[PDB]
Symmetry: C3
Subunit: 310 residues, 3 copies
Amino acid sequence: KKMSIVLAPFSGGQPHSGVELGPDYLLKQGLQQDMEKLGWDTRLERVFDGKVVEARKASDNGDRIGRVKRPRLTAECTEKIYKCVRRVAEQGRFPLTIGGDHSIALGTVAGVLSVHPDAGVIWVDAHADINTMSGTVSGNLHGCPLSILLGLDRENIPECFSWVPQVLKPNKIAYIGLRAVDDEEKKILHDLNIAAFSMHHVDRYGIDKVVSMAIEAVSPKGTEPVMVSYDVDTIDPLYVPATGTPVRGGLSFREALFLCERIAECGRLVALDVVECNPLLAATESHVNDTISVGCAIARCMMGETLLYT
Amino acid sequence: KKMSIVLAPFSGGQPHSGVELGPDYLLKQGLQQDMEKLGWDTRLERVFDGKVVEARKASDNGDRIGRVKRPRLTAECTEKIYKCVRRVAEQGRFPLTIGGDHSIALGTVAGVLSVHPDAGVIWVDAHADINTMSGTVSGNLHGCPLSILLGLDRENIPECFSWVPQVLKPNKIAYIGLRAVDDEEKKILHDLNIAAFSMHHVDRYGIDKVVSMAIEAVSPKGTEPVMVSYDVDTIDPLYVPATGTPVRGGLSFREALFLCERIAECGRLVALDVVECNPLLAATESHVNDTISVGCAIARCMMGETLLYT
Amino acid sequence: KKMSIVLAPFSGGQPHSGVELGPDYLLKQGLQQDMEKLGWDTRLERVFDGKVVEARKASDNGDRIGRVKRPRLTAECTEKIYKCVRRVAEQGRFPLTIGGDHSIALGTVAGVLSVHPDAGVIWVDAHADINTMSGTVSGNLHGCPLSILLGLDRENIPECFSWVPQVLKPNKIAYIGLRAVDDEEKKILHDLNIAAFSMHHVDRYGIDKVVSMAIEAVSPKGTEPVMVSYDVDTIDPLYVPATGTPVRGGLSFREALFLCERIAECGRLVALDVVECNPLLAATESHVNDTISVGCAIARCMMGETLLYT
Ligand SMILES: N[C@@H](CSCC[B-](O)(O)O)C(=O)O
Ligand SMILES: N[C@@H](CSCC[B-](O)(O)O)C(=O)O
Ligand SMILES: N[C@@H](CSCC[B-](O)(O)O)C(=O)O
Ligand SMILES: [Mn+2]
Ligand SMILES: [Mn+2]
Ligand SMILES: [Mn+2]
Ligand SMILES: [Mn+2]
Ligand SMILES: [Mn+2]
Ligand SMILES: [Mn+2]
């Protein structure tokens, strides 16, 4: 029962700067003490200095490729997270990565699937994050990780991303909480028949059935390892206000945590990302604490914490 | 795929004046662009000038019949909406009427059922709006449309309402979201065995089962056209604050829209009313935008918009 | 159909003083008029003066036994509530007790089970309130009533509590809404196999199934009388803000009341406690009204009020 909290304070996948402060805020809330309190032998893994990275991030506007912003910086930092996560998993430890915007999942998923090729991926997000290099309108890379991981539109992916191992297939990723999918992304999920459970399915079937369907969708043999990449904006902005891309009509605080308890319950969780916490994008300090405490709650519930005896 | 957005800026069915500004606010939010964006060939239909109507509304206190307020003005304006909606439906276009208080449904339902006599009616509301002429305590006509449409207490309905065609029967109307029913109304729904699904049923069975039961209740042959008259106060005041009669414990933003997606999904929706938006009864501007954006969201979801590919 | 509203303005079971004002606030909201309006012949029963009790409560810090605070005062006042409630039930009236912190349930449950030994108990709370005398960390007695009622850790219960009749067994108590259970309490519910339905079960099965399971858990013959001890902090703080121990992720306003309607619906409710309303712990006056109105709503729904005809 060993764990490595991989710190990935990266904001190059999007415009707003506060998101790279996420790792520190979670740790200040006592994230590591909570994990140890849950019986986990933990250790921190700093992939790179967030200030040094943000210094180059906010200054280097020339880092572009058409509409795509900061492909170079993102490719570099993401490769490092990949190496770190890959290493943590090979050492037999559970990698719990804290972001940072969702572009870091390019390295986390790559790292985990490199050690666990049969691992399924449950993407908890209000967004599909699967825009292609030539299809993204905003050019914000935190909304394109899955396209790169799946090797879509390879005829347009930069050479600086050639390091990304092609280990994630479309039948091994399932979404939960979708409600702000771009038309290009819609076509993509449809053409590739990717298991996507929107807020419609949650409202229609209830969170429990959706989580079960999501686990089943990526676990054919019913024995595969499972990884969860958790974007906090999946949770309704009234619970998680401090985030870059909030979308109305998300999961309630209860569903957000119940989902974690159901996953932890299956016992095959092998990795977890908690991304998009941005303390700066908070109206009041109650917005900060409410968002950061949610990040730690997700971790605790994912990692074993229950309401009753266990 | 032709549509006519019938503008019905009427507030004579209740005390507060801002409700007649609803049509303009929705259109300012881009309601028509959204409908066209959904592939609808749309056109606007102005039934009457809202300012001219409100001028007479706020001044003519003498327009009364006992407890009943503004029966004359309501009868006149409502007959016009009836003629307009009837015309739009005969022209083969989908009439999407924006209010305005709910007294406008006297003309919308009358107009639609006059062209589609087998059409079922789903009344989404926190209230039953079925008080009789001699039974209403407030005298606000927006809470009596269904009594007049059903021909209840005819022995007390004014001659100025004699224009209302008797085309709606009790087994063709189903409620969703009820939670503020007057005792007289309770007796009525019971005696007439009207399909009424309260917040109790939503809490008990879930929104999906309730919508299904509501569609089935008014669609015996399973092929009848369906009309939805949507009062925004059905949605909990914390999502739709700018409204005249808010009632605690309503539908969540998600259920409010999921209901629309389920209806649009059956493919037999033939008309839609979106009523009771009152921008003036908003604490802040965030209350206005939150309420008006909800009105447009209902329209989009009712008219075909989905979270995933379709 | 006779009822006695037992007033129990006690705050000695916890630190904050405003909770003893609950009874008065509910009554000011028209609690008694509501009950009579529901056809109940009601009468008030004042067990003791709240000011006199609070005067001694806030001054006598010496009233302690280790970590346990105010065991003497709590034992005395609680015995009185026991005598009063026992009397009301013997007179054939329904005892609706208003608190006051939850330590008053030591007298209410004792009083009711003394007349109805087969009565089941449904404890609606975010907390288990079953800490033992020697196991409580805070020493606040409102979090220990069930341990004393069940006769747990009797080897450590003070003589001033020897008056408590041992009439409640572990298979006759079922919880609903748990989400802040102490580790010692967890072990206890597990070892005694007490039916405990946490927010997990509500999120997993829905409120309706949970209420049904709770009623079944304490009603083996399916004919036993049922008593509900309702702690308002079970409801999410965003609906019930004015309370001493709010916990995030509670029941929605709708579930909180639906639960009441389902219970009232079985027809075997024999007693009800509505505890922990503290008007002083309110940010604004809207926090007060929102909390107090909830208390009265619980009463109305428990006592027969429905959304439709009945
Ligand atoms: N469709 C948008 C969404 S980006 C969402 C990023 B994330 O899911 O990590 O908040 C885009 O491509 O900019
Ligand atoms: N029972 C009330 C309710 S009026 C409700 C109007 B509407 O449902 O359109 O907000 C009355 O008769 O005044
Ligand atoms: N575990 C805490 C909880 S006390 C809860 C009291 B009440 O459920 O009535 O709000 C303790 O022993 O102080
Ligand atoms: Mn994301
Ligand atoms: Mn997102
Ligand atoms: Mn209405
Ligand atoms: Mn209404
Ligand atoms: Mn309690
Ligand atoms: Mn409690």
